[PDB]
Amino acid sequence: TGLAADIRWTAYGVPHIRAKDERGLGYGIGYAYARDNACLLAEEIVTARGERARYFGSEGKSSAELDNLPSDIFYAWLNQPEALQAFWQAQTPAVRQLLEGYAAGFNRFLREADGKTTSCLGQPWLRAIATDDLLRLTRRLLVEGGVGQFADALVAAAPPGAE
Amino acid sequence: SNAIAVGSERSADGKGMLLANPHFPWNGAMRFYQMHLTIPGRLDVMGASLPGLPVVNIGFSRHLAWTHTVDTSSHFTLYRLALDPKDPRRYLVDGRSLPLEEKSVAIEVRGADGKLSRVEHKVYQSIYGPLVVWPGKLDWNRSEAYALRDANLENTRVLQQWYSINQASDVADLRRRVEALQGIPWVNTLAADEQGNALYMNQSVVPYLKPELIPACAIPQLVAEGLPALQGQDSRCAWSRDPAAAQAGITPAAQLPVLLRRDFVQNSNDSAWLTNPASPLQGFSPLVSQEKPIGPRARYALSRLQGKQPLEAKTLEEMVTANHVFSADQVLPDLLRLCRDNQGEKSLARACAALAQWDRGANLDSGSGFVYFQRFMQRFAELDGAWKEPFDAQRPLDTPQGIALDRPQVATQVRQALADAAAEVEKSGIPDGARWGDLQVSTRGQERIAIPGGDGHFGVYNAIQSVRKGDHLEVVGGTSYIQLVTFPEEGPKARGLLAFSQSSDPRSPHYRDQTELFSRQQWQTLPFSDRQIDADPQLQRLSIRE
Ligand SMILES: *C(=O)CCCCCCCCCCCCC
């Protein structure tokens, strides 16, 4: 609560979010983004949570074209609870509020959605999101120029046998 | 990605101007999304961002516009480990045997039977970070392994960094806010403001090693392949500490390239070096910026930007919409000469006809010459010493150029390359007088939309990357969010498009509306002022709370 946003959309579905604080601003962002891209975010959160194989089995790939299971291993390693928690505790109040609003706004759209702009309505993986999920997305983007480019290489790193 | 910032000394109105032309995926977790964010009195910023981020990543405000390009700086280092001779799960630092740490993760897997099973996986970690295996390159054998230290894992400042950029007033404020926090992971920043400053910063999170340590700490054979690899058996090859760095182990801001000018700055994913050739950026760490031959997108932009003529908004727009295949400038004239020299050679006839009739563009109506040209260039790239003028460090804007047709062996190889390229094009299902736009498309439901542009490796500023899917090339990345910003007295004038549209959902009214416009290269107003927003006949408004 204490979450309020004013949203204007201009041509082509461009949102203009006005609010009195970061929390309301987040709220508007997440609501507007969910209207256009709920399924994308849900899919990418699944990826970033390392839950691809759980929903889709080992035969599929993420949108970065990694096999589900190696992808899951990488993201489960990347986004361990302590990494998330340390990351959260380092955030400024303003950023925390931005993220809280966003999660809340995304979930509000999910509560109300009737399929008008959401093709994955009903899927078990389209779920309410939490701030940790946005931290998971953030960290996935953070390492895109580093260990992210070696996700497969990390999963493959196993010690030698008797050779 | 491309970025050009124009300052008071070159713009047609004596003020700042910015072209933002990032090249990013059309799907997934890096799909740009447009938004305007306002907390009245203290925040008013518009642009585009990555999924899940409640900040603007590339945008503009009242007196400022900025954008980003993937940099050539290193954001991690590999560490070659020397293994304990008695135990390949132990590694030596200063000759002391340290054990690897093991972290297990457990993953649920949906089986064929629809039921879940638990997969346990061990992740081996050293003091540097996790081990990585690239078979035939970075192995884990009985004498060596490689670990990876990612500098951005400890960058908790990334979100605060963009929020801060979103609040910046002008170029000097932006520079301050970016240098103070050092939260940018892996991009350059280019910016212009109303007063006419043009800024380039190679200001990101980059592993720090003092300059006297580099030659001794590098793995020579791996750095020559462009991998940031260090000796992990030596404690002195740990990233250096400098109390002025915002994060331990990273390069201080004072040591990263910055260029402040009133004429122009540009970047097309090459290093800082020739950001503006009138003022070269040099003497940086090899982890930071090296003096390497620029790609053709940069060469193209410099050929348009150098000189004394004023630059208009339209000038910069047309650098994108021209769809000019700049790599043609280097090879096509000699290639066409070789075609004339081999008239009546049956294998070359169709290729040479197509190439000589080609507009040298990646426009919708561009002839099949572009297709012949691409396949030839792919083979050309594999030839040894075929350039008439090879890269020259003293003429970096103008080399390489031309085909060494005077060397008889090269002439034989280039012709065989052209025959082979012709054959591949003729094998494929390309019709008769089919155009580039008939081939390159973006699928939208059961329909297809022709997409102009082409691969940036061929010097097309409007970079579009496609993959073969059935009978077409399906666009997967490239030109995405476009903004072109100027600063007339009333307020920022911003123009552009989101190439793939706001929504990735087929059910959306905004799934393909800007894609139709991108096809026709019809850029639009990006409304920023209340007035601009109110002038929009499609205006919708909703207020929400809980
Ligand atoms: C061309 O190189 C495209 C550059 C696009 C970069 C988008 C802005 C940078 C976003 C990184 C934010 C990291 C979030 C954790």
Find the helix or strand (DSSP H, E) in which B454 lies: none
CA B24 to ligand 1: nearest atom? 3
* Residue span of the structural domain in which A163 resides: 1-163
Q: Where in B85-197 does DSSP place strands (E)?
A: 87-93, 96-99, 101-110, 116-126, 129-132, 144-150, 187-193
Task: Please tell me which residue of chain A has the smallest CA distance to B88.
Answer: A159
Which has the closest alpha carbon to B348: B377, B376, B325? B376
Query: Which residues of chain A does B53 touch, with a Cβ-Cβ cutoff of 8 Å?
Result: 134, 137-138, 141
* B1, B8, B271, B285: the active-site residue: B1
- B169 included as an active-site residue: no
Where along chain B do its domains lie?
1-75+151-290+475-536, 76-150, 293-474
Q: What number of residues does chain A have? A: 163
Cβ–ligand 1 contact at A138 (below 6 Å):
yes
CB-count exposure of residue A94 (10 Å: 0-12, 13-18, 19+): middle
What experimental approach yielded this model? X-ray
Contact A97, A73 (CB under 8 A): no
CATH classification at residue A98: 1.10.439.10
CA of B157 to the centre of ligand 1 (A): 14
d(CA B72, CA B187): 9
Q: Is A10 exposed, middle or buried (0-12, 13-18, 19+ CB in 10 A)?
A: buried
CB pairs under 8 A between A and B: 295
- The backbone torsions φ and ψ at residue B223, rounded to the nearest 5 degrees and listed phi first, read -65, -30
Determine whether the shortest distance from the Cβ of B157 to ligand 1 is under 6 A.
Answer: no
In sequence order, the β-bridge partners of residue B232 are none
A38–B30 CB contact, under 8 Å = no
Architecture of domain B293-474: Orthogonal Bundle (1.10)
- Residue of the nearest CA to atom 10 in ligand 1? B57
Cα torsion A27, A29, A32, A33: sign: negative
Residues in chain B within 8 Å Cβ distance of A55:
110
Say whether B28 and A64 touch across the interface (CB within 8 A). yes
How many angstroms separate the CA atoms of B69 and B55, rounded? 17
Q: A90: which 2 tokens?
A: 């380092």
* Residue B183 Cβ < 6 Å to ligand 1: no
Nearest CA in chain A to B137: A153
Q: For the domain with range B1-75+151-290+475-536, which CATH number is right: 3.60.20.10, 3.30.300.30, 3.40.50.300, 3.40.430.10?
A: 3.60.20.10
Nearest CA in chain A to B207: A146
Contact state of A54 with B140 under an 8 Å Cβ cutoff = no
The encoded tokens of residue B221 equal 């054979």
Closest to A78 measured CA to CA, from B236, B132, B153, B403? B153
DSSP B262-304: SSEEEESSS-STTSSTTS---S--TTT----PPPHHHHHHHHH
Distance between the two ends of chain A, CA-based, in angstroms? 62
CA nearest to B348, candidates B359, B339, B360, B357? B339
What is the nearest CA distance from A67 to chain B, expressed in angstroms?
12
Residues of B in contact with A30 (CB under 8 A): 54
Dist. CA B122–CA B201, nearest whole Å: 40
Does A125 contact B at CB distance below 8 Å? no
Residue A77 contacts residue A148 (beta carbons within 8 Å)? no
Q: Is the dihedral of CA A56, A58, A59, A65 positive or negative?
A: positive
Ligand 1: which of B2, B30, B57 to mutate, judged by most atoms within 8 Å of the beta carbon? B57
Q: Resolution of the experimental model in angstroms, please? A: 2.3
CA of B165 to the centre of ligand 1 (A): 13
Rounded Cα gap, residues B284 and B282, in angstroms:
6
Contact criterion met (CB below 8 Å) for B479 and B498: no
Decide if B76-150 and B293-474 have a common fold: no
Residue A14 structure tokens: 């461009």
Beta-ladder partners of B541: A8
| Residue of A7, A63, A147 lying closest to B29 (CB–CB) | A63
CB atoms within 10 A of CB B179: 16
* Max CA distance (Å), chain A: 66
Among B76, B137, B142, B503, the strongest candidate for a mutation testing the A interface, having the largest count of A CBs within 10 A, is B503
Rounded distance from Cα B68 to ligand 1 centre (Å): 7
Residue type, B144: E
8 Å CB contact between B205 and B247:
yes
18-77 of A, contacting B, C-beta below 8 A: 18-22, 25-33, 35-41, 44-45, 47-48, 50-51, 53-58, 62-64, 69, 72-73, 76-77
CB B450 within 8 A of CB B422: no
Can you tell me the distance from the alpha carbon of A101 to that of B368, in angstroms, rounded to the nearest whole number?
A: 51
Distances in whole angstroms, Cα of residue B238 to Cα of each of B84, B100, B244, B287, B510:
19, 17, 17, 14, 50
Q: How far is the CA of B62 from the centre of ligand 1 (A)?
A: 22
Task: Answer yes or no: is the C-beta of A142 below 6 A from any ligand 1 atom.
Answer: yes
Contact B20, B3 (CB under 8 A): yes
Contacts of B540 (CB under 8 A, 6+ apart): A8, A9
Distance of CA B404 to the CA centre of its chain: 31
The answer, yes or no, to whether any atom of ligand 1 lies below 6 A from the CB of A141, is yes
Q: How far apart are CA B491 and CA B529, in angstroms?
A: 7
The DSSP result for A111-128, as a single string, is HH--SSS-TTTT-TT---
Number of domains in chain A: 1
Report strand pairing: B440-444 vs B472-479: parallel
Strand pairing category for B258-261 and B198-201: antiparallel
Cα–Cα distance between B57 and B51 in angstroms, integer?
10
Q: If you measure from the C-alpha of residue A55 to the centroid of ligand 1, how many angstroms do you get, rounded to a whole number?
A: 29
Strand (E) or helix (H) holding A142 = helix A131-142
* CATH number, domain B76-150: 2.30.120.10
Rounded to whole angstroms, the Cα distance separating B46 from B48 reads: 7
* Helices assigned H by DSSP within B360-493: 369-380, 408-427, 436-439
Ligand 1 pocket check: which of B4, B31, B53, B68 to mutate, most ligand atoms within 8 Å of Cβ? B68
Hey, are the CB atoms on B508 and A36 less than 8 Å from each other? Answer: yes
